């Protein structure tokens, strides 16, 4: 299926003394592969997946230099934005950045993205065509003009369509044993009685990868959303994911209800029933 490489960056200003806290993480699909934390001792980009350890010293030196350059841009940004928004030096503020590329089943470029937020709000984002910018307010508009004059979008477009795609392809091959493997959900159902007349059925999906999944209930073969609760998909902590969906039913009628599971690791969707 499709694949992605995405980088996430957060800087949080520290008004009283010193530079912002800066944290960078890189992912291929739902797998973290590198990190940098300004509070950590190494001051280096660090591996977080065994397949990236294949890369040599030049890689790690080059990624470290770039990630530090990213951190300094964020530091300057935090000051500029405090200026744009007429804010004091007293409060803590945040910038967040995400960028990366998607490829389809044929591993060719599909989509690129680059977006930026200040204090959790949209600030500026590259449009889908990778040629222009969406600026949310007049501050972002001043940035847009600055980036247009300096042809920032052209530089980014080249990276997103070229380097990003090339290196995603490289990682996919080097990490093939895990990155190109699907882990189908391990499913089961649990039962609880709330009272003499009400029951809860909970449909579980565990140990799956990638994170994308659909769990739904049917009653007598028709979709049931009322009286259901669906939790957010959550990391197990070993690289796989978990999710459940529950339905409340009259006691004795459990057999009308079926759980349906869709996942790329399942060639056809699965059905579960109580008992």
């Amino acid at each position: 299926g499709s694949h992605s490489m995405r980088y996430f960056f957060t800087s949080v200003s520290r008004p009283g003394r010193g530079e912002p806290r800066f944290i960078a993480v890189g992912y291929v699909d739902d797998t973290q592969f590198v990190r940098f934390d300004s509070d950590a001792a190494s001051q280096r980009m660090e591996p977080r997946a065994p397949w990236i350890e294949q890369e040599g010293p030049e890689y790690w030196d080059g990624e470290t230099r770039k990630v530090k350059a990213h951190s300094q841009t964020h530091r300057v940004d935090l000051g500029t934005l405090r200026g744009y928004y007429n804010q004091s030096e007293a409060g803590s503020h945040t910038v967040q950045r995400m960028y990366g590329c998607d490829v389809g089943s044929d591993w060719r470029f599909l989509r690129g993205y680059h977006q930026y937020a200040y204090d959790g709000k949209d600030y500026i984002a590259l449009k889908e065509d990778l040629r222009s910018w969406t600026a949310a307010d007049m501050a972002a508009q001043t940035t847009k003009h600055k980036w247009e004059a300096a042809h920032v979008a052209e530089q980014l477009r080249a990276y997103l369509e070229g380097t990003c795609v090339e290196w995603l392809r490289r990682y996919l091959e080097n990490g093939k044993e895990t990155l190109q493997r699907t882990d189908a959900p391990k499913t089961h159902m649990t039962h609880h009685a709330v009272s003499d007349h009400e029951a809860t059925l909970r449909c579980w999906a565990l140990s799956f990868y990638p994170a994308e999944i659909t769990l739904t209930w049917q009653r007598d073969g028709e979709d049931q959303t009322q009286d259901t609760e669906l939790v957010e998909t959550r990391p197990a902590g070993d690289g796989t994911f978990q999710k459940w969906v529950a339905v409340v039913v009259p006691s004795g009628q459990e057999q009308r209800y079926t759980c349906h599971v869709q996942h790329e690791g399942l060639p056809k969707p699965l059905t579960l029933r109580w008992e």
Partner: peptide, 9 residues
């Protein structure tokens, strides 16, 4: 592989 340069706002 990170983008080579990042423009300031």
């Amino acid at each position: 592989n990170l983008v080579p340069t990042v423009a300031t706002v």
